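yo

u said u wanted the structure for the complex thing, so here. seqs first:
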Amino acid sequence: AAKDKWKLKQWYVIYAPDFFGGVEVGLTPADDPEKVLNRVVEVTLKDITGDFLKGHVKL
RNA sequence: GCUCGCUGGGGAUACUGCGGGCCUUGGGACCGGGAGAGGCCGGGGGUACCCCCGGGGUAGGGGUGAAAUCCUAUAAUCCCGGG
Ligand SMILES: [Mg+2]
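structre next:
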């Protein structure tokens, strides 16, 4: 019955804000699309633009 | 010699006292560029902790040398968004 509830979830793709390039940053599961609002994701500046100097900046 | 105590006169001016004059070293006043968790009043913040509401998840959490009381199917511990 529990695994039945897990099958109801779909995956959504998360994009960076517009002025950072709007690139893909990850995926998240949810059954109702309204529940995805106000979720927060943390990424490093190196992932956005590749350079091993700014790996300690978190957005 | 003792009753070391009193009293009439004369002399001296180093020290203490008293009166006058003149100083700046002790102390105080003022000006300059700086130092400091010294005090009082107003404003703005930092993490942390406790309670409440909403979403996920399901059987333990907590605590001791070892345990038990205690919290938890009215959904806890743990994770996320708010007050
Ligand atoms: Mg809940």
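The two ends of chain A are 38 Å apart (CA to CA). Residues 2, 30, 35, 37-40 of chain A lie near RNA strand B (CB under 10 Å from a C1').
cya
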